[PDB]
Chain A
Amino acid sequence: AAARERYARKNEQNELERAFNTIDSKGDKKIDAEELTELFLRLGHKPKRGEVEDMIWEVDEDCDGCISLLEFQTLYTRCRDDKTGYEPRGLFNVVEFVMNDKNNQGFITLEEAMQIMYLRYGRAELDMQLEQVFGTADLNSGKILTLTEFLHCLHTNQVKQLLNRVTAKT
């Protein structure tokens, strides 16, 4: 399963660099909380009162305040190989959306490419993150991807084993 990931990284690196510059609006290397709202407006989604502060808080862990391109690759790699890490993914999603965008409204079938790269998974597992069907396409935006990803992560996180454990029968 390594080949999918290595090949994906080999190509997405150049897309990522421009994705970074494009998210920046001041022509610098630092991504301020101010820029994030502008990006969401471009996607067509609205943040909540404290969302941006959490978004900036969780990603940065080598200094405090604004974020830097170095933090951004660290985040990218950790989140990408995060899978069984139970780790934060608040600002990973917005950047992955922007990089996986080339239509400037969202993406349709490319979710599957995202999915296969993360895992082969299943058609039923696809019916989990969203309701896309193989034959039909849809229109999509920023609103419907971030919310569903965020909810899925909350749904997996909740389930744990207390008296939900099940042992082989006698």
Chain B
Amino acid sequence: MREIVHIQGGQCGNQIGAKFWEVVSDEHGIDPTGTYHGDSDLQLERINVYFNEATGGRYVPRAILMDLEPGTMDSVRSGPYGQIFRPDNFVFGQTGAGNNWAKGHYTEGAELIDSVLDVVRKEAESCDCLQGFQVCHSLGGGTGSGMGTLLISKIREEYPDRMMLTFSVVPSPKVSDTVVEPYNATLSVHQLVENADECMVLDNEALYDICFRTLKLTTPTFGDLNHLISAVMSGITCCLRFPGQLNADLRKLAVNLIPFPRLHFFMVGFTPLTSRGSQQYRALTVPELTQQMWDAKNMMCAADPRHGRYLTASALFRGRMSTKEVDEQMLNVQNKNSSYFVEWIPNNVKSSVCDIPPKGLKMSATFIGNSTAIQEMFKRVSEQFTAMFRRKAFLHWYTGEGMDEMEFTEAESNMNDLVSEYQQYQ
């Protein structure tokens, strides 16, 4: 029916998506060789959203891997569920950006994104009625930020009346891998404010604290973080793949959650998330799900909403549940903590239910809250960017490649008006 193509950029995007296709294929019962082995008819009836039957029970994922280094692509086909992707979908450069956003947006982008667009165009016309596009990338890298950024801009010029998601991890001062993170973040977000339909703000700090306290893991490699992110992404699209009492497509959530067109950066959470010592001691009820859902520490972004107010919030529930519990729980969590919600919008929480849980659990949830606390992140990177730019450090790879001085001044100005308009609407 409605179809979503998948686009993974850079190293972070590629590895996030690899675990994503593994988890999804397990939900629909496709083995790593790409054949159907499920039992229920509910699994076979909605695999056209993410796959195409090739020949004789061969279901291939509708995904496009794109980056600038061969190591990532080889690491995809090596691991399991690596043999399911069509090899033509490996659009692929060779030289590399080197964490230089200009090289990802002006130097190397000019020779790859045309090739990327051919594969993307083929995957859009391969399906009938597009629901939207799904892009997983970072904001601190070069080949994920710049390459994915220019791709997003060109795509919105081609298919403008279609939805678009960008799952993006953002950098933070405590988890600081690259040195030019602020230059990449502020310019990348400057493009996201005018191109993306809605963006989902992620960051690595929150992922580390989820695996520290909630999951109580000892050695949380990147496989577990990608495992966490994949559960959230599968949750946002369960409504398209399984029937339920209250369905909510991507368009339904965006039109309902975004009160003003430029304010489309979200904070995400997921429930339930429990450690192996406490997976036995818990119950599975809607209120138990709700408090662990709205918890401050359980946000999958390191921006505490309790420093500000909620504008809108959304809940996507999965499993056999009673809709009265759904509605009364949203009403109670809004009445006790009444100051944390915006005032000139009553009933700031939209909720929906789907009748198919993730495999291995009786009942789960997914939270999408559009709060006003996100301006902290924009200031936290803006001051670092201004601190660097007022002495032109690290600028010659930017100005020597094609940027001028006015682009950084444009970035600050757009940065400053967005944090100012967040401040007004709060």
Contacts and interface: CB of A to CB of B under 8 A. Distances in A.
Interface of B is mostly: helix
B219 interface: no
Contact of B261 (A163, A169, A170): A163
Interface in B373-426: 424-425
Contacts of A170: 424-425
Nearest to B426: A170
A170 B424 CA distance: 7
A31 to B, nearest CB: 41
Contacts of B261: 163
Contacts, number: 4
A169 B424 CA distance: 9
Contacts of A169: 424
A127 to B, nearest CB: 31
Give the contact-size bracket for chain A: under 10
Nearest to B425: A170
Interface string B254-278: 0000000100000000000000000
Contacts of A163: 261
B171 to A, nearest CB: 29
A170 B263 CA distance: 15
A117 to B, nearest CB: 40
A133 B183 CA distance: 50
Nearest to A163: B261
Nearest to A169: B424
A94 B424 CA distance: 53
A102 B180 CA distance: 72
Interface string A155-170: 0000000010000011
Interface in B28-78: none
A163 B424 CA distance: 19
A11 B329 CA distance: 75
A169 B420 CA distance: 12
A56 to B, nearest CB: 34
Contacts of B424: 169-170
B198 to A, nearest CB: 13
A132 B309 CA distance: 57
4 contacts: A163-B261, A169-B424, A170-B424, A170-B425
Interface of A: 163, 169-170
Shortest Cβ-Cβ A-B pairs, 4 listed = A170-B424, A163-B261, A170-B425, A169-B424
